[PDB]
């Protein structure tokens, strides 16, 4: 298993969110920091099984605009397609 953790209270912008994903999922250095790039990396880069623990989700929405919800939805759609992703929302 690959484990990824987002501490929601430390996310102060959409950039912080994408940089945290880049580290936690061990993404490519070319990572495009956008929703199509995140989708591509779930589809054809990231290691599975994956466990994403996203804490303080509400606080991470505060400073990312609609970024936290759209990123979460990319993970849920990937899971819906069969990627072995376990999502823990705290």
């Amino acid at each position: 298993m690959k484990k990824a953790v987002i501490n929601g209270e430390q996310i102060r912008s959409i950039s912080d969110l994408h940089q945290t994903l880049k580290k936690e999922l061990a993404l490519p250095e070319y990572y495009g920091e956008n929703l199509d790039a995140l989708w591509d990396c779930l589809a054809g880069w990231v290691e599975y099984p994956l466990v994403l623990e996203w804490r303080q989700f509400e606080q991470s929405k505060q400073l990312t605009e609609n970024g936290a919800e759209s990123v979460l939805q990319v993970f849920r759609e990937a899971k819906a397609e069969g990627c072995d992703i376990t999502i823990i929302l705290s």
């Binding site: 490519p28 070319y30 990572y31 495009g32 920091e33 956008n34 929703l35 199509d36 790039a37 989708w39 591509d40 589809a43 054809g44 880069w45 990231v46 290691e47 599975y48 759209s70 990319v74």
Partner: protein
């Protein structure tokens, strides 16, 4: 015969035959052959193939939408190992775009 994997080769192929060249396989087809993306073993389970043909959801809305139009994508400049940042994007009505910066920017090429 040429392994067609460049922006121009694949774009011309798409417009000419309305399909990708035979060296493209979808992510699900590659996984059925044993591809494990984090291992970077696509050339070992499917020699000479590149990932391509999956639905592209245009999540940042950078490509133009239209009633009835859907998009797909394929990898460009890939030959073996881990995937790169280059992709061709093509619509159901044969518009063709590319990205070389992992979907940050797109250039219309057909």
């Amino acid at each position: 015969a040429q392994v067609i994997n460049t922006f121009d080769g694949v774009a011309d192929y798409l417009q000419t035959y309305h399909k990708l060249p035979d060296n493209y396989i979808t992510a699900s087809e590659a996984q059925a052959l044993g591809w494990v993306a984090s291992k970077g073993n696509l050339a070992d389970v499917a020699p000479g193939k590149s990932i391509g043909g999956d639905i592209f959801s245009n999540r940042e809305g950078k490509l133009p939408g239209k009633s009835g139009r859907t998009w797909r994508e394929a990898d460009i400049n890939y030959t073996s190992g881990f995937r790169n940042s280059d992709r061709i994007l093509y619509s159901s009505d044969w518009l063709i775009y590319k990205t070389t910066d992992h979907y940050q920017t797109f250039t219309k090429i057909r």
